[PDB]
Design a protein around this ligand. Structure first.
Ligand code: HEM
Length: 153
């Protein structure tokens, strides 16, 4: 359970992201794919991209980064009361896209890295700890839905 103070830190940086959702989304997906190439393999849409320049040039990858960050922002702004938003996302990522929980750990690390690079004055250690807690709560709650469906592994 995050405290109200921890939520405020999370959402303060997140309001900065919403100024350039697409730039952040590209940076986070590129970092994920470069740091963890097995993740790129889950996207039939992107598996043709072989270089970071090709990734940066893909308008389709930038569109998907916006999709991802708009869904995460709606979850964060629920401050934990996110069951309605998480259900469909867990269901599709477990049963259709076949994404292990560990790859949600990986994208969480990429989000934290990109927020530190782009917003260092609003992402000191207090805010990095709070965002880590928020992303752990997201993963916890997705993992419980995976387990229900038989995909916690
Ligand atoms: C913060 C974490 C994430 C969020 C909020 C998120 C959100 C979304 C949303 C909103 C969609 C489209 C609707 C849907 O299919 O449910 C989507 C699609 C998809 N996601 Fe995620 N996602 C996350 C992480 C990941 C990770 C880590 C992977 C792979 C490693 C992944 C793989 C995919 C795939 C393969 C699709 C379908 C893309 C396509 O072919 O159109 N997601 N995601």
């Amino acid at each position: 359970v995050l405290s109200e103070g921890e939520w405020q830190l999370v959402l303060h940086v997140w309001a900065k992201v919403e100024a350039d959702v697409a730039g952040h989304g590209q940076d986070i997906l590129i970092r994920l794919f470069k740091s963890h190439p097995e993740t790129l393999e889950k996207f039939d849409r992107f598996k043709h991209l072989k270089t970071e320049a090709e990734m940066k040039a893909s308008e389709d990858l930038k569109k998907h980064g916006v999709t991802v960050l708009t869904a995460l922002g709606a979850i964060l702004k629920k401050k934990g009361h996110h069951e309605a938003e998480l259900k469909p996302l867990a269901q599709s990522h477990a049963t259709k896209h076949k994404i292990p929980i560990k790859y949600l750990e990986f994208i969480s690390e990429a989000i934290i890295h990109v927020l530190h690079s782009r917003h260092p004055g609003d992402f000191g250690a207090d805010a990095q700890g709070a965002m880590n807690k928020a992303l752990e709560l997201f993963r916890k709650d997705i993992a419980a839905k995976y387990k229900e469906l038989g995909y916690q592994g």
